[PDB]
Amino acid sequence: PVDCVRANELCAAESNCSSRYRTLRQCLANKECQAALEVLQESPLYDCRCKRGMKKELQCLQIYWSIHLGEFYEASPYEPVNHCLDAAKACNLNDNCKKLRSSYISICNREISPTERCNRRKCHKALRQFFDRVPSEYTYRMLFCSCQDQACAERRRQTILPSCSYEDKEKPNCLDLRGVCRTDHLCRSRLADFHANCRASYQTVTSCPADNYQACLGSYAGMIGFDMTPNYVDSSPTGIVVSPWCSCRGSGNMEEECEKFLRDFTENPCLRNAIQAFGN
Amino acid sequence: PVDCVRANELCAAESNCSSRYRTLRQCLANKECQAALEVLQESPLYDCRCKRGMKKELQCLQIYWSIHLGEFYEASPYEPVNHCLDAAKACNLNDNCKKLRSSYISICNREISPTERCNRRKCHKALRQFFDRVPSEYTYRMLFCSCQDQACAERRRQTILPSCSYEDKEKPNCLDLRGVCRTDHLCRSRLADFHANCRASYQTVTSCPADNYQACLGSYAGMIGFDMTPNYVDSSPTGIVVSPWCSCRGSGNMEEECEKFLRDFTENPCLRNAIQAFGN
Amino acid sequence: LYFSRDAYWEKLYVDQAAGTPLLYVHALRDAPEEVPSFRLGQHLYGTYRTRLHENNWICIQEDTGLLYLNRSLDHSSWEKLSVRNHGFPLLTVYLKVFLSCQWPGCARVYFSFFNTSFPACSSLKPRELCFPETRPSFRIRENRPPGTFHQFRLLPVQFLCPNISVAYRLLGLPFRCAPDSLEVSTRWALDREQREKYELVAVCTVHEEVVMVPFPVTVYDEDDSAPTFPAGVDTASAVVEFKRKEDTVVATLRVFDADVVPASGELVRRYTSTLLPGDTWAQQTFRVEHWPNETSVQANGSFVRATVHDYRLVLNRNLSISENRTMQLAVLVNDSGVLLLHFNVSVLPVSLHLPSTYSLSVSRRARRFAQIGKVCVENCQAFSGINVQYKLHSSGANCSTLGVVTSAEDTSGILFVNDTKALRRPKCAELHYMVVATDQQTSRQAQAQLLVTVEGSYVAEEAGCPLSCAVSKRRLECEECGGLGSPTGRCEWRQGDGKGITRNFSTCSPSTKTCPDGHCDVVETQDINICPQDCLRGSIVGGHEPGEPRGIKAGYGTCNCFPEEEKCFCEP
Amino acid sequence: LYFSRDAYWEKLYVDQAAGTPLLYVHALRDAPEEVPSFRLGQHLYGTYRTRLHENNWICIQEDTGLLYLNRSLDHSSWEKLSVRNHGFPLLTVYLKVFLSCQWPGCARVYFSFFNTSFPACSSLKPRELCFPETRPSFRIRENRPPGTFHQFRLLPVQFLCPNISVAYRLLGLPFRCAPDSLEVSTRWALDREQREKYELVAVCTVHEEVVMVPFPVTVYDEDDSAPTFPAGVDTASAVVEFKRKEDTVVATLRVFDADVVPASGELVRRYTSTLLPGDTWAQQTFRVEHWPNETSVQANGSFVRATVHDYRLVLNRNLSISENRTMQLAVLVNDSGVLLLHFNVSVLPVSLHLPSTYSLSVSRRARRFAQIGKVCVENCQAFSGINVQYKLHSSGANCSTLGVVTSAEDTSGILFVNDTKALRRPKCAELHYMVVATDQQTSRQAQAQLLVTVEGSYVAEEAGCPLSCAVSKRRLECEECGGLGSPTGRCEWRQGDGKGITRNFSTCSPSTKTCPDGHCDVVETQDINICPQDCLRGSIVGGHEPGEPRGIKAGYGTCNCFPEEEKCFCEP
Amino acid sequence: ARPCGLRELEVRVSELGLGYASDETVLFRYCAGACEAAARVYDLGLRRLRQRRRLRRERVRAQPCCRPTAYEDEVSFLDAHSRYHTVHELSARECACV
Amino acid sequence: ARPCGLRELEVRVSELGLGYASDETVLFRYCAGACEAAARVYDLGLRRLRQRRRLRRERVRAQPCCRPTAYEDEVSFLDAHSRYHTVHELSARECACV
Ligand SMILES: *[C@@H]1O[C@H](CO)[C@@H](O)[C@H](O)[C@H]1NC(C)=O
Ligand SMILES: *[C@@H]1O[C@H](CO)[C@@H](O)[C@H](O)[C@H]1NC(C)=O
Ligand SMILES: *[C@@H]1O[C@H](CO)[C@@H](O)[C@H](O)[C@H]1NC(C)=O
Ligand SMILES: *[C@@H]1O[C@H](CO)[C@@H](O)[C@H](O)[C@H]1NC(C)=O
Ligand SMILES: *[C@@H]1O[C@H](CO)[C@@H](O)[C@H](O)[C@H]1NC(C)=O
Ligand SMILES: *[C@@H]1O[C@H](CO)[C@@H](O)[C@H](O)[C@H]1NC(C)=O
Ligand SMILES: *[C@@H]1O[C@H](CO)[C@@H](O)[C@H](O)[C@H]1NC(C)=O
Ligand SMILES: *[C@@H]1O[C@H](CO)[C@@H](O)[C@H](O)[C@H]1NC(C)=O
Ligand SMILES: *[C@@H]1O[C@H](CO)[C@@H](O)[C@H](O)[C@H]1NC(C)=O
Ligand SMILES: *[C@@H]1O[C@H](CO)[C@@H](O)[C@H](O)[C@H]1NC(C)=O
Ligand SMILES: [Ca+2]
Ligand SMILES: [Ca+2]
Ligand SMILES: [Ca+2]
Ligand SMILES: [Ca+2]
Ligand SMILES: [Ca+2]
Ligand SMILES: [Ca+2]
Ligand SMILES: [Ca+2]
Ligand SMILES: [Ca+2]
């Protein structure tokens, strides 16, 4: 599969496909749009994907979402891929994980004013930099580490430093938070990536699509650093409950859709089986 | 008085004077040359001088000697301007004289081969750099310091490091050495400067032109660093005898001119009175 | 007209014969003139809104709303579909069903296809004989004429295993299961405001197994409630006297509404708050801020939810002191039934007079930048948005010793020794000042007398002393030497404890009430030699915890500081 | 015709009357047909060849050669001249005097002008009454018909003070002062080759003072001497056997000449050396180099000077060994009277055979790069321009231990241990080599036998030893441990003295005959761990004196070296 | 003897004695060794001037002590009270005999 | 105490003890003083690790010694035998508490 940047380059090598692509881009952002679509269905821009932590990821995602024709689930534009104290020790004894860990901790723990707890945007950017370019035998061992008491679960909850990046002054509605995340380009793509590898199915024996725990943990860890940031709700040892910082209050006649959105975090059997099996 | 570089610049501001200057320069290096001369006699290039240690001295001397019409004495193209151990102490306690002293000593005392005693050209260049841009209360106090025994006179003779820059394998003829020096541009100008401030005259009570000891010492110290380099012939305390590294042998029928050239160093009353009076 | 659900479910197999019924659909109506038509979509959609092929196999009966099979199937027709899925495994297709794609105007019907054939009648567990895998959830709008919304029989199961006796049963409820026909209907019309959720249990009996399945029904709302006061309160009175800042909540009142339907997207467009005109001073100084919040109220022993709209009245600019007005304001509330609100406001002016005499003293051994006392307009810690600066005016004009800076935290002025030379003279021993309290927006002012007596002996200073108190490290080298900010000429040693990195760290300060306090006031920020351990911009060496704007918030053991290098050391 | 001097002198004053004689001139002649004309230059020149004004005051008599005054002077005419001097003070003007500006064709006459008038006859000292300030010096060519060259009377002095009796007197001499007329003439013609200088004393008697003045006459030369052998030697025989370098002085012979006149500028153009042809091998291998030198010979108890021309015959290229020739060469010498020179040359070939057997041993404890012995063609230190390299050829081809490098200083090869593994084996205990002595220009060679027995026990090495001997600092840590270049396995400590910075500095070396020697031979320059104190390119810390290509030439106290960092320490 | 350079160690944070009550493990790179082949003419001159008591009786250094040139940036950790801490310049990166 | 920096002295060449037999006077700029306000967290950590004998018993430095950063280039002189000598890097130019 050819990614969308090289697909844009091969589209730039011709005139007709580039003309139809710019035509549909000017129409989106009758008889013209349908002609541009029936040309671009055979293009290499059609069925192009992106990758995780690649060079110029945002440009690939801008190429992708500019030809999406518009909705609860969306197609993922990606390649179809005390224990916690010991994990912190194994990150500190490295030289890349130590530098990026101290980067996001020293940014996210900088109190500015008595009203502003921290600088939010640089904290989220440092979290994205830590969970993009560190190998996944260090970022997962710290984040999914099975516990048997309160101190282990508290160290595990305090990993993404929830008092700055997770919490807020208020709990917004989950549908409005989903609209805020779907306005963005990176957050929408990571949310659609989470809604592809961690759904629940009654067919498989492990409730996951194609029995891939690694894809579910990779889709979960790719959301830390955005507006739809999940973390653990409490310091309970055994009960592994994740959710964003939202709630179903103030929904209106969309209580069922909002609870069905929140059950994919709170009561997802695939994600709980994946975290518990990585614990084993 | 306007120096010859600014005179060349003011000559470049007009067309007729520049055309006659380039005409005479192409003729030298009847009815054309005499016309160019009778134009350039009223030019600012006529009666222009140079200075000692100025910016771009060699270009000023190239401007001067390109309009000289050709001879024992020549006109100077310049502005008409233990004690030795204590002098060495006063040079070492400085920060400019110390650096340039250690420069010329470390260059002139670098033995290369069993046949070549030293690198001659860099030694002469370092001597010129020391006796150009050090103030003259340091270069004269080391070079003209009255002595009363042998060790003082030997330290005084060893000042310009004679085993590298003064001596050679052979003593050439003084007329051939004068021709070698007059082929050069800097050496010819420093020799003509010495033949203007240290001549002997029977009119003054001090045998010097206009009773100026400072001009004679400045004209003597400006020759160290060239082919006609003077120094002391021996370590005698009282007898102050200077000469170049030449002799009157092999002269032919020009013995009288060669001895008359050498008496301006060996038996000059103005120069001996100047050195002895600086000793007082 | 609206569908009772949004997503229907059905299992498909291989070589299912023609004329095999798949499922029923149900469309509850709104008015007694409507007959539910049912048209199918012309595309067998696949995964993630992908067209595969035009619908040529599943037909529909518009009258009873019956999805059934018109044609048969084979492996070639499904390998025809699984190629066009664009790299995805064919797991579930779906159709669109119109009725006259989103709820309520449309409903999509899923179909899970199995590669195997139809299994035997004895090979099926009764759990897969009674109810599908995806349990339903039904949607009924309130205040609507009731009808039929569900049917129990899995039609291919009884079409292909007709000899199994399967019964269905439900447990003053408005629902009913009809006898000898397994439709489910509702007796009377519903209202959410009495009860909103109905959880039931559908019971399936096979031959022999009894299976219980949860059965959720959620009642949806219309805007059938005009807004209501909590208890009779239509007016709110408040006095604007001391705060006067740019945005201060003056008055606040609740509005109760049982309606929920204008939700958080369209609540701005519908619940309308209009401040009624009449005076431009109100509309240039006040605004009406509105936000809702949902609460839960009881109806008949259950919990329904309703909205509580808080309307508050917020300042818009810094009010001047010279305002002496009172008004009544009218707010209109529109629930798109109309409500009116009243606010009594009273903006009272402020007198800013001072005490007549300030009598205080100062030692002769004191140094530059030493705090003595405070000047303050009498209502000190109640001003919020008012700038009040203080000055000095010496009557003798010869003996300038003291100075005043305006700490805007309390809006008070601090008396500090500025000149050490005039303080040591025996001529300037009784100083008379005229303190003037000014104002920035209006030129109103006040004045008071300041008599200060300079009292004490004088001892010369040691040449081995540094310029700050914080350079000393121990107790004996702190208390036997003086610094810069001291009010008496000597430094004060405060002792912490041995509890690790704490806020109580032992140090040498000019004043133990001002320097290790955690705030860098206007006196200490003049020249950084006074109190570096509250005001520095540098680095702390040792186990520490940094101050939040600046300073040392916590340290381990003793903490001394070199302000000439911007460095501190915290160490036991 | 030629003037007896070159620069004439005369003093001028203010308001000197017309018709006042200034001076006489004298022009000695060459042939008995010449009458000396005298024309003046048309420019009163000033300082440094500067024209001032056309000559309009000083006239000349061509017959007697008399410079006299035609017109008078005043202050206006000299202030007219002193303006045109171009920034120079008017001190001396001069005229040019032609006769048919340089000697002998011209002579310039100086005039010193005084601002004062003519002084009184009693105001003049007799020293300023007899002779001028610039004493004369006269020039007479030899072998010329003699005449009159000087006159005594200061003409304005006797013209303006005629009543003072002033007499002049001189002391087998060829000169004479005429009676009753103060001209000075020469009796007979002169030759420089008998006597070249005549110092006389002119005696002036006034009224009354007797004044003595030196009176120099220098006799000038012509080319009146054909060249001469020293004593009969016309041939020089020399044998070219061992040196054969590019430029070696083969033979040398003197040529005596009393002539001096072709001086060092024109001696190349006149004294001509021509190598006579006949064989191209001589002209491609030999050249005739020529240089003069002046000596002093006695004639009649005096010292005259003459030239001695050394003619030598120098090689031109590296001669091959296969030359077996002999020749006689002829050189022509031209004194522009002609001379012929002969050279017997004999170029003998060189045999390069070796001794038949080289028997030597080596210890088993030895290390890599340890010098054992020398291979050398028998006439060792007599080859100069011949490249002779040496090789090895092992007969067993299994036991490669030794190696040969060619030191071109002596043109000899050095036997050094190259492989330590093959030396410690008990199988390779008697080694047989065939040493081959080659040649670069011609492929002639020789060969010899090398039997070497490897003898000794073996002791293992300490793990606490460094890789070089020079890392050790004291005597006990030097002699109790081994290095790299040692021939026996242990290092050798040489002790210097306490005489300051000397060439005899105490150190630890592999071999005290090779390492602290002052030369970095071909063995030591392979890997720099062997002998850093003769081969390093680094820095020496302490009182030292650096080696002239490289190394330590002198050090103070003990000198150790770290070659891994290129550093040495010299310290007591 | 061994030349001066980087040495490594793995220590608990509470063993550093800074006052932090934590239990995580940090990597500690210090400089260690002995300088022998780094003395210069300045060192011999200043040592000989100390030996004659020519100095003004102050604290001078006539042997090159081996100190780091640069340091690492940040080490962050967590403690027993769930409170992160960042330590600046705790360990070395480059050892030089200055 | 006084902070560490350049100090100057004027000495005979024979007093330096290098072995040169001369009588000229040279200017000698050394570094002197005491460092108090230059310790870092590395210094406290390495000192506390020495106090528990955690180290491997080597030569470590837990106080910043004050050494020069750069040196002067050349000092040339003459001796009692009329023989010039050039000494490289005899005195300091920049003092720093490294
Ligand atoms: C709404 O009311 C709940 C009741 O507990 C409260 O927790 C929440 O903060 C309120 N939200 C707002 C925006 O007032
Ligand atoms: C404000 O106005 C009322 C109206 O009469 C007056 O009585 C009162 O004195 C005024 N306030 C002040 C501070 O003057
Ligand atoms: C409430 O809003 C609706 C829609 O704008 C409007 O038609 C109606 O008149 C408003 N009610 C009042 C009392 O203005
Ligand atoms: C209003 O008052 C506050 C409180 O002092 C002040 O910070 C702010 O700048 C003021 N704004 C205006 C517009 O005067
Ligand atoms: C303190 O005195 C200085 C010196 O004149 C002056 O510049 C400064 O304004 C004074 N401070 C006050 C608050 O008066
Ligand atoms: C010439 O002879 C003299 C005699 O002493 C000697 O000193 C000089 O070196 C000789 N010069 C040459 C070039 O042979
Ligand atoms: C050189 O030539 C002569 C001529 O007969 C001969 O006798 C002699 O052997 C030759 N030299 C050699 C080395 O062969
Ligand atoms: C010597 O040289 C002169 C000038 O070149 C020439 O005329 C004369 O023939 C030469 N003598 C001989 C013998 O060649
Ligand atoms: C001549 O021999 C010398 C001596 O070995 C050598 O240095 C030089 O390169 C040789 N020249 C030629 C041209 O062979
Ligand atoms: C010494 O042995 C090495 C290793 O094979 C070889 O490269 C080198 O040429 C040898 N040296 C001699 C002089 O043979
Ligand atoms: Ca209702
Ligand atoms: Ca309502
Ligand atoms: Ca309602
Ligand atoms: Ca404070
Ligand atoms: Ca003759
Ligand atoms: Ca001759
Ligand atoms: Ca002759
Ligand atoms: Ca050697």
Numbering used by the authors:
A (entry chain D), B (entry chain C): 37 to 65, 75 to 115, 121 to 131, 159 to 357
C (entry chain F), D (entry chain E): 29 to 128, 137 to 207, 211 to 246, 251 to 379, 387 to 622
E (entry chain B), F (entry chain A): 100 to 197
What do the paper's sentences say?
Glia cell line-derived growth factor (GDNF), Neurturin (NRTN), Artemin (ARTN) and Persephin are four ligands that induce dimerization of RET through assembling 2:2:2 ternary complexes with RET and the co-receptors GDNF receptor-α family proteins (GFRα1–4). Here, we report the cryo-EM structures of four extracellular 2:2:2 ligand/co-receptor/RET complexes, including GDF15/GFRAL/RET, GDNF/GFRα1/RET, NRTN/GFRα2/RET and ARTN/GFRα3/RET, at near-atomic resolution. The structures show that the extracellular region of RET adopts a ‘C-clamp’ shape, which is stabilized by extensive inter-domain interactions as well as binding of calcium ion at multiple sites.
The same procedure was used for the structure determination of the 2:2:2 NRTN/GFRα2/RET and ARTN/GFRα3/RET complexes, leading to reconstructions to 3.4 Å and 3.5 Å resolution, respectively. A recently published medium resolution (5.7 Å) cryo-EM structure of the NRNT/GFRα2/RET complex displays a similar overall architecture. The segments in GFRα1, GFRα2 and GFRα3 corresponding to the helix-loop-helix-loop motif in GFRAL are much shorter and adopt extended loop conformations. In contrast, the D1 domain of GFRα2 is resolved in the cryo-EM map of the NRTN/GFRα2/RET complex, and packs closely with the D3 domain as seen in the crystal structure of the NRTN/GFRα2 complex. The D1 domain of GFRα2 makes a few contacts with RET-CLD1, which may help stabilize the ternary complex. However, there are large differences in the angle between the two wings of the batwing-shaped complexes, which mainly originate from the different conformations of the ligand dimers and their different interfaces with the co-receptors.
